[PDB]
Design an enzyme around this catalytic site. Sequence first.
Site, PDB file in Angstrom:
ATOM      1  N   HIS B 351       0.874  -1.218   0.024  1.00 45.60           N
ATOM      2  CA  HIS B 351      -0.100   0.135  -0.034  1.00 45.60           C
ATOM      3  C   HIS B 351       0.746   1.305  -0.029  1.00 45.60           C
ATOM      4  O   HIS B 351       0.364   2.224   0.402  1.00 45.60           O
ATOM      5  CB  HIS B 351      -0.979   0.041   1.286  1.00 45.60           C
ATOM      6  CG  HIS B 351      -1.784  -1.254   1.342  1.00 45.60           C
ATOM      7  ND1 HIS B 351      -3.085  -1.335   0.773  1.00 45.60           N
ATOM      8  CD2 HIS B 351      -1.425  -2.334   1.886  1.00 45.60           C
ATOM      9  CE1 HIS B 351      -3.621  -2.120   1.194  1.00 45.60           C
ATOM     10  NE2 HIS B 351      -2.731  -3.111   2.002  1.00 45.60           N
ATOM     11  N   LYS B 542      -9.238  13.777   4.181  1.00 46.32           N
ATOM     12  CA  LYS B 542      -8.291  12.854   3.938  1.00 46.32           C
ATOM     13  C   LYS B 542      -7.100  12.948   5.064  1.00 46.32           C
ATOM     14  O   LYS B 542      -7.151  14.259   5.219  1.00 46.32           O
ATOM     15  CB  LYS B 542      -7.530  12.688   2.637  1.00 46.32           C
ATOM     16  CG  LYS B 542      -7.226  13.998   2.180  1.00 46.32           C
ATOM     17  CD  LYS B 542      -6.706  13.694   0.475  1.00 46.32           C
ATOM     18  CE  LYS B 542      -7.589  13.574  -0.366  1.00 46.32           C
ATOM     19  NZ  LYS B 542      -7.803  12.369  -1.264  1.00 46.32           N
ATOM     20  N   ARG B 543      -6.299  12.231   5.386  1.00 47.36           N
ATOM     21  CA  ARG B 543      -5.059  12.646   6.417  1.00 47.36           C
ATOM     22  C   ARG B 543      -4.373  13.875   5.783  1.00 47.36           C
ATOM     23  O   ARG B 543      -4.404  13.762   4.457  1.00 47.36           O
ATOM     24  CB  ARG B 543      -4.491  11.326   6.749  1.00 47.36           C
ATOM     25  CG  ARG B 543      -4.977  10.420   7.595  1.00 47.36           C
ATOM     26  CD  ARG B 543      -5.181  10.881   9.019  1.00 47.36           C
ATOM     27  NE  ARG B 543      -4.287  11.149   9.766  1.00 47.36           N
ATOM     28  CZ  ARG B 543      -3.477  10.343  10.411  1.00 47.36           C
ATOM     29  NH1 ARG B 543      -3.982   9.297  10.648  1.00 47.36           N
ATOM     30  NH2 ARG B 543      -2.209  10.690  11.076  1.00 47.36           N
ATOM     31  N   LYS B 548      -0.440  14.746  -0.611  1.00 45.29           N
ATOM     32  CA  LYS B 548      -1.785  14.774  -1.013  1.00 45.29           C
ATOM     33  C   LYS B 548      -2.299  16.542  -1.419  1.00 45.29           C
ATOM     34  O   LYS B 548      -3.396  16.523  -1.644  1.00 45.29           O
ATOM     35  CB  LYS B 548      -2.699  14.607   0.333  1.00 45.29           C
ATOM     36  CG  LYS B 548      -2.630  12.986   0.625  1.00 45.29           C
ATOM     37  CD  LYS B 548      -3.397  12.643   1.903  1.00 45.29           C
ATOM     38  CE  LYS B 548      -3.158  11.283   2.335  1.00 45.29           C
ATOM     39  NZ  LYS B 548      -4.096  10.371   1.482  1.00 45.29           N
ATOM     40  N   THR B 650      -9.523   5.979  -1.719  1.00 50.49           N
ATOM     41  CA  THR B 650     -10.471   5.178  -1.824  1.00 50.49           C
ATOM     42  C   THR B 650     -11.560   6.226  -1.406  1.00 50.49           C
ATOM     43  O   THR B 650     -12.922   6.063  -1.667  1.00 50.49           O
ATOM     44  CB  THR B 650     -10.614   4.276  -0.616  1.00 50.49           C
ATOM     45  OG1 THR B 650     -10.131   4.781   0.738  1.00 50.49           O
ATOM     46  CG2 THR B 650      -9.923   3.100  -0.974  1.00 50.49           C
ATOM     47  N   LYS B 654     -15.703   7.117  -3.112  1.00 50.22           N
ATOM     48  CA  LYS B 654     -16.710   7.102  -2.231  1.00 50.22           C
ATOM     49  C   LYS B 654     -17.674   8.390  -2.607  1.00 50.22           C
ATOM     50  O   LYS B 654     -18.562   8.400  -2.783  1.00 50.22           O
ATOM     51  CB  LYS B 654     -16.147   7.446  -0.654  1.00 50.22           C
ATOM     52  CG  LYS B 654     -15.701   6.554   0.167  1.00 50.22           C
ATOM     53  CD  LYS B 654     -15.074   7.076   1.022  1.00 50.22           C
ATOM     54  CE  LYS B 654     -14.363   5.708   1.833  1.00 50.22           C
ATOM     55  NZ  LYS B 654     -13.575   6.186   3.038  1.00 50.22           N
TER      56      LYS B 654
HETATM   57  O1  LIG Z   1      -4.150   4.794   3.110  1.00 46.72           O
HETATM   58  C1  LIG Z   1      -3.422   4.445   3.238  1.00 46.72           C
HETATM   59  N1  LIG Z   1      -2.194   4.347   4.009  1.00 46.72           N
HETATM   60  C2  LIG Z   1      -1.137   3.673   3.669  1.00 46.72           C
HETATM   61  C3  LIG Z   1       0.091   3.351   4.409  1.00 46.72           C
HETATM   62  C4  LIG Z   1       1.233   3.408   3.721  1.00 46.72           C
HETATM   63  C5  LIG Z   1       2.503   3.179   4.412  1.00 46.72           C
HETATM   64  C6  LIG Z   1       2.632   2.747   5.813  1.00 46.72           C
HETATM   65  C7  LIG Z   1       1.339   2.992   6.599  1.00 46.72           C
HETATM   66  C8  LIG Z   1       1.332   3.066   8.026  1.00 46.72           C
HETATM   67  C9  LIG Z   1       0.292   2.903   8.712  1.00 46.72           C
HETATM   68  C10 LIG Z   1      -0.864   3.312   8.095  1.00 46.72           C
HETATM   69  C11 LIG Z   1      -1.187   3.167   6.740  1.00 46.72           C
HETATM   70  C12 LIG Z   1       0.129   3.146   5.636  1.00 46.72           C
HETATM   71  N2  LIG Z   1      -1.340   3.248   2.383  1.00 46.72           N
HETATM   72  C13 LIG Z   1      -2.700   3.685   1.938  1.00 46.72           C
HETATM   73  O2  LIG Z   1      -3.432   2.607   1.592  1.00 46.72           O
HETATM   74  C14 LIG Z   1      -4.600   2.486   0.831  1.00 46.72           C
HETATM   75  C15 LIG Z   1      -5.218   1.339   0.910  1.00 46.72           C
HETATM   76  O3  LIG Z   1      -4.838   0.446  -0.413  1.00 46.72           O
HETATM   77  C16 LIG Z   1      -4.396   3.472  -0.357  1.00 46.72           C
HETATM   78  O4  LIG Z   1      -5.544   3.549  -1.097  1.00 46.72           O
HETATM   79  C17 LIG Z   1      -3.643   4.670  -0.091  1.00 46.72           C
HETATM   80  O5  LIG Z   1      -3.378   5.371  -1.510  1.00 46.72           O
HETATM   81  C18 LIG Z   1      -2.433   4.456   0.565  1.00 46.72           C
HETATM   82  O6  LIG Z   1      -1.501   5.780   1.016  1.00 46.72           O
HETATM   83  C1  LIG Z   2     -12.203   6.487   3.024  1.00 47.42           C
HETATM   84  C2  LIG Z   2     -11.469   7.347   4.197  1.00 47.42           C
HETATM   85  C3  LIG Z   2     -10.210   7.433   4.182  1.00 47.42           C
HETATM   86  C4  LIG Z   2      -9.332   7.340   2.899  1.00 47.42           C
HETATM   87  O1  LIG Z   2      -9.513   8.633   2.087  1.00 47.42           O
HETATM   88  P1  LIG Z   2      -8.263   9.031   0.955  1.00 47.42           P
HETATM   89  O2  LIG Z   2      -8.827  10.282   0.482  1.00 47.42           O
HETATM   90  O3  LIG Z   2      -8.293   7.850   0.108  1.00 47.42           O
HETATM   91  O4  LIG Z   2      -7.080   9.394   1.731  1.00 47.42           O
HETATM   92  C5  LIG Z   2      -9.540   8.146   5.156  1.00 47.42           C
HETATM   93  N1  LIG Z   2     -10.320   8.590   6.194  1.00 47.42           N
HETATM   94  C6  LIG Z   2     -11.628   8.063   6.365  1.00 47.42           C
HETATM   95  C7  LIG Z   2     -12.308   8.575   7.630  1.00 47.42           C
HETATM   96  C8  LIG Z   2     -12.290   7.585   5.193  1.00 47.42           C
HETATM   97  O5  LIG Z   2     -13.643   7.125   5.561  1.00 47.42           O
END
Ligand SMILES: O=C1NC(c2cccc3ccccc23)=N[C@@]12O[C@H](CO)[C@@H](O)[C@H](O)[C@H]2O
Ligand SMILES: *Cc1c(COP(=O)(O)O)cnc(C)c1O
Lengths: 810, 810
Positions: B351, B542-543, B548, B650, B654
């Site tokens: 990821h 988003k975070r 981003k 993701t 949505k």
């Molecule tokens: O949301 C995410 N967090 C981390 C992530 C990547 C690397 C280290 C981490 C460590 C803790 C939590 C999350 C992560 N990877 C992410 O995974 C999602 C699910 O496939 C993708 O849609 C996002 O594009 C991607 O950024």
């Molecule tokens: C879907 C969702 C995310 C992931 O969003 P991205 O725009 O893909 O970073 C993060 N946080 C919450 C609360 C969500 O529902």
Amino acid sequence: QISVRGLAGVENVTELKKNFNRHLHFTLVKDRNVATPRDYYFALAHTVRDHLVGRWIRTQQHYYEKDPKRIYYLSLEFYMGRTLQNTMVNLALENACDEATYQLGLDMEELEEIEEDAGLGNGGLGRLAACFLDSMATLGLAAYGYGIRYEFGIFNQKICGGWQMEEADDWLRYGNPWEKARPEFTLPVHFYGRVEHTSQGAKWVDTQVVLAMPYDTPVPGYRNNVVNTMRLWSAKAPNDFNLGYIQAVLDRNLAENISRVLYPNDNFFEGKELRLKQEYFVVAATLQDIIRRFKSSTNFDAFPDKVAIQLNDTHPSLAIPELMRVLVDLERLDWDKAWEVTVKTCAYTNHTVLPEALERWPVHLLETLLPRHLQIIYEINQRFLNRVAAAFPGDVDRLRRMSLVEEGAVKRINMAHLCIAGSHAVNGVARIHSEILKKTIFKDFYELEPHKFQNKTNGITPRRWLVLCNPGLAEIIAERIGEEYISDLDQLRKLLSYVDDEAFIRDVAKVKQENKLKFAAYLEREYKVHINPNSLFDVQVKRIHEYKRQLLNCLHVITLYNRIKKEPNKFVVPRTVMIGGKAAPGYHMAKMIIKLITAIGDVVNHDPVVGDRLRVIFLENYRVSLAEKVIPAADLSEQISTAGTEASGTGNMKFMLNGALTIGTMDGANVEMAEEAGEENFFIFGMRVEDVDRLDQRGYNAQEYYDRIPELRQIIEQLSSGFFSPKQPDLFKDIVNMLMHHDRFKVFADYEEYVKCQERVSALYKNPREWTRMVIRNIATSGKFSSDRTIAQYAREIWGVEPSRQRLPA
Amino acid sequence: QISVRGLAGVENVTELKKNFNRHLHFTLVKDRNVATPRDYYFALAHTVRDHLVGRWIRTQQHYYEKDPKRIYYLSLEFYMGRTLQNTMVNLALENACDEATYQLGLDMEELEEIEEDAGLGNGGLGRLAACFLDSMATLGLAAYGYGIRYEFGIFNQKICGGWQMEEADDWLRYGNPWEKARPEFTLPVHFYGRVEHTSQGAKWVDTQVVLAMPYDTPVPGYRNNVVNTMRLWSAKAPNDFNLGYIQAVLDRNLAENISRVLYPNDNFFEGKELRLKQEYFVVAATLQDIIRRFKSSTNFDAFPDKVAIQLNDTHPSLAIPELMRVLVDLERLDWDKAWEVTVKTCAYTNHTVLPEALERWPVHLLETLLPRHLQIIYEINQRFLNRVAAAFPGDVDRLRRMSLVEEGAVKRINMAHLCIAGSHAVNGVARIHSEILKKTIFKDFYELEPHKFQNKTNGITPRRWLVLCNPGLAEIIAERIGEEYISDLDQLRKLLSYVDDEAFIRDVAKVKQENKLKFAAYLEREYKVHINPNSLFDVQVKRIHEYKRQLLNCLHVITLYNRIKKEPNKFVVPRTVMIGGKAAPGYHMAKMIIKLITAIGDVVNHDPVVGDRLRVIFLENYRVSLAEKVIPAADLSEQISTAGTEASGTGNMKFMLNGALTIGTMDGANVEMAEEAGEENFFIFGMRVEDVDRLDQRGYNAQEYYDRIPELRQIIEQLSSGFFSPKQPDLFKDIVNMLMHHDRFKVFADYEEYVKCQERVSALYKNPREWTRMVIRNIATSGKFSSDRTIAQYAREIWGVEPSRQRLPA
Ligand SMILES: O=C1NC(c2cccc3ccccc23)=N[C@@]12O[C@H](CO)[C@@H](O)[C@H](O)[C@H]2O
Ligand SMILES: *Cc1c(COP(=O)(O)O)cnc(C)c1O
Ligand SMILES: O=C1NC(c2cccc3ccccc23)=N[C@@]12O[C@H](CO)[C@@H](O)[C@H](O)[C@H]2O
Ligand SMILES: *Cc1c(COP(=O)(O)O)cnc(C)c1O
């Protein structure tokens, strides 16, 4: 099966069964193919809990409508034990649940054994609290138990190589079905900070907040449909606490440590900050709750007409300055009016003789932790000493002795002094103890305010301690005199007219024999040990302390052993000597005594010449649920504290009720027990209080006894030389050394009279009929020692409320 | 009320009502006079939970009988959100519960709002796990989610003076009615110790034991009566732990810290021991459970035919050496056979793009904590590098690049390398991301084993993300094409035949307007802020991360503001710009970006010349439950990551599903979204991946853009000079400095094309009919982005199981 256990109606049984299956499915999310005995216990527990709920809600409703005066029993200890059987007894569900579980193919007794003891107490004091809650509910008093929900109760005792090991009592691991969390009634408690003086009086600022979350446990009265509440507080950190990030979240545990663990010191004082935090935590949260409830009835003149607060020893003594702080600083009452309210609200029960058990808190601790409370305490002290000075002009020495503040290297607050000053009533817990309070340690306080000093002799609940633990005895009694005695124990006196009835004599001895068989079997399965069930069961169970003189018992046991070895082919009445109890983890000498007991066992129980004529057993992990088993099995109750040291005792009463004869000193409630039964029906020996005083004046020289009693010299030589510790010959030098030079409890002084008295016990045991007749005379006069009597006296003579045996609607 | 919410039968409603009153009384021990909304939520929760129980038991029973292949989804994060509505949707109880609660005089929506989010995740990755569990249950797969029951989830975000404050997410305070503790399935997990080599292979000895206690949460499939399990482990100390006394009991908290708190780093790697303990804890407990279950079906050849283990990123990568350790050291398989089993069992989903997010554990950490695992890892590395050497003889550089062990000041294990070596399948999470894995970061691994590399483009569950959060849209769709699309989202394509239907156009726009009104009202009550509901709702949630490019959004917002000030009397399409998200607590720059957003808001929202034409809102505490509210209200979805940095995303999906148009870069799943809808129905701008590479080669000079774009120069001068921070003129120098000299994500490079593209959005919004037609074309082609499609691909192409839409009996 037996009548005192209630009816098993077809409707009731059918309903219990279907509710049991409903909880197994919906509550436990199990089918019958994967359920363990533990799932079955939980299903049953949830089923019985359901019968409490209606009554609990209606009882609390009733108290809101009628608005009676409310009793608040503040204790750091509630030694509750198991709840399932007690609930069944008090709701008359025991036979119905037996039947319902039988038809499901389960054995209810086996499911009962799965329940953990709620071990939130050390011994006598915690258990007294539990017995009292039971009696308060049975007597229809609007009473609330308030305490701490410790995550870890009294430790589980393991014996390894004859030594006590402690392990954590993780009693909540599987969940507590009896408690209801009430997170919505969470309250803030404050610590540290500092005092600002403004125009508008003193302000306590820059404090650390710990939250107190209450858990409510139902306390059912005996078949009166009354269910009172025990509310226990749990510590929780606020969500802004410390708020790098990760560590701040982990540091929440510092706040929550307050309710983590019960301090395991029976009758000793350790000045630890965490213990003081526990004391304030329970006091601060409880007083807010009390006041909230009072305000839902600005005028505090009626406060003492609506509120009684009983202090279980000095452990919640901070209730006095806390009540003052709230009334003065927050409600803006003047000092004198607030003080009046406080005194009329509070009452103090003393459970303590030994000076090392008295709470004396260093001032530097209170200064840091509770700055405002220390100010209020100093003010109390000044005004109090001003009254002393006016009543006893020129007696500067009295002023020193009565001060709440003790001068010394470290200044200390004497919490007992604070309690007497701030309470309208001070009681001891047996007549001899209450007299000793007036004559010695509180003599000065008595001379100033004689009206405050009362006695309330302790008691035990006959529900748990007869009906529940000894149904066979309950039943044969009920056969002759009916069931009413269970809530009116004075009726047992009617059994004196059956003392020459042959059938009753046969039945009393049969029940005892059955209890002994059942307990012998329990020892075999759970702890792979064999005992002769035709032997006299000589049991001493209680916390391990020097003043309780388990060592005196040890000396008797070795005497019997040395006598058998000298004359192996002579008849002696066989005995199983059973000693059980926990030692406080830091109490070296208590830990050595346990080790000595097991070392005697190791020699005596493997001597082929002894045969099954003498067995010594250390009962592991003595707790409430083990007491329910061993006390009905006992023949001889050992109550052998040095005269003047056991404030009351309550074990003694349990055994009296359950058909054991007592060998004891004229100490504590032993005195009143012998007076009720008659001295001829009691095995009294040893120094009286007066005799101990006479010895202290001229000085106690143990050597003199060693020199004059050859039998005793032999024992001491055996101990010293490694007879009982071959691999480590000097293992017990600390014990010998203490007995010979530093024995505060004068073990040798009572030795001769003890051994002689023990010979009279053996002689009577050879005559079963006369033994059983004496037992009847004991059981029959045990009525006074019901906690119902005790609570009725507290209610009429301290709290100013009338008990009631009238039933709420069902 | 609406059809997709199910039937409200007279019988059902009556039964729900009586069960609600039963739980209020027996479960909560409340009457109706003292119950709060929270008691009502709990009564309802317990009532709905009861409908899961039968299905849960029967489902788990079914899997024992049929013994299908089992899927184990190992993740450190499950971002579940609220459970009550989701359960009602999936059991078709929503209308019946609405009706039942209505007749009790309660509003179900108000009770839903009382439920805490289960926030056991950071964002995209945790939520993907949650969406997957939903789809696995809906597709009738014998699937288990395995993770950690953190006491504290993702922190609650407060804004104070425009700054993020974190506070602890105490989500368990009031109890979790959805979980069932299973203390009877507690398992030991080992740490530290050392390795002894004997005759009988290696032994891991002198370890510290932490217990792992499982909590099971039901995962209902969509109206198929399937209920899968999510099992989360909680850390518990053993009862002999440290066993002066008091401190030993308090030190139990050291062991239990393992499951205390979720690490809040989105897309960053911190090498902390506690994080590694969390990773092993979940792996060790899960593998024992997996193996126990497998043995209740000595021969591990069938293990991969009965077990699939999916690794959610490298966080549970220790599953690979742990499985080897169990098979080799405990089961006594030879290495090669065990390795075969392991590879065929495990599969790894990546990821991650950004190198600072890749887990590289220092060897000294693994050496101390998991000595045996490090040995096994070295052995894996040797055998792996031996295959590389044979395939690519002489390529010593490749050997260095592919090593599981990175050489340097500190040696590190590359956990990604370990996962590729030990897995039969490696996938990325969108097509462009999977290609980038093959072309760049895992190019070498791809050349050795091309067969392992797959794509599985991400998805979202249309249950939570359409039916649940947007019932009005669900309904108007269901009016035309039926209900089947909810479990077969490709059917939405049938909506393309309604793109010129006037009634459908009217209804789609009406639903959007209603969602906007409802969200505007929510902002007013819960956060005292007013917004024009006729404005375009421009939302980026988003975070908070640099990649981003929330900052790019900020630059657009200030551009609009500067344009209004230059020409105040010119028409512009009104906008509400809403930006929300959490920053990781130690990520300074993310915290500055939040501060900048609120500072822009402070200027823009109080400029009278601007009027209600432009509003900037920072949405506090963005979480799953806030996403369910704001996403249905959005017009414009901002997906503006630098090409090559967002693996998938993701959120984007949505918004597509919920009737917002997308402005985005050709990044992640944006690419596939535009391909499905058609590029003409998508607002694409900015560099492609290829363009970013071209810029990197010659070098990124931000200055060039500053020099050539006057509008951009103006913004930078404003930031620098304190236009947005009057009291602290230099507040944002770190932001300027980074944009000008150290911008890894080339914010300026995309600025011109972004602003122009934003003008095309405004132009289309002036034409409601054509805006809504384009929306229809988006909704209608969103079918591919169902997590049902995703899971079906995982099942057929990795796990080797066939999904099923067939219902279990009820
Ligand atoms: O949301 C995410 N967090 C981390 C992530 C990547 C690397 C280290 C981490 C460590 C803790 C939590 C999350 C992560 N990877 C992410 O995974 C999602 C699910 O496939 C993708 O849609 C996002 O594009 C991607 O950024
Ligand atoms: C879907 C969702 C995310 C992931 O969003 P991205 O725009 O893909 O970073 C993060 N946080 C919450 C609360 C969500 O529902
Ligand atoms: O069992 C007890 N522990 C303490 C006790 C005394 C002093 C300090 C403590 C501290 C913690 C726990 C108990 C105590 N006091 C005791 O109270 C019982 C109830 O009235 C009496 O029957 C005992 O004779 C007395 O010894
Ligand atoms: C009654 C009881 C006590 C108090 O016994 P004494 O002999 O009065 O010290 C202590 N522990 C337990 C478990 C009890 O049931």
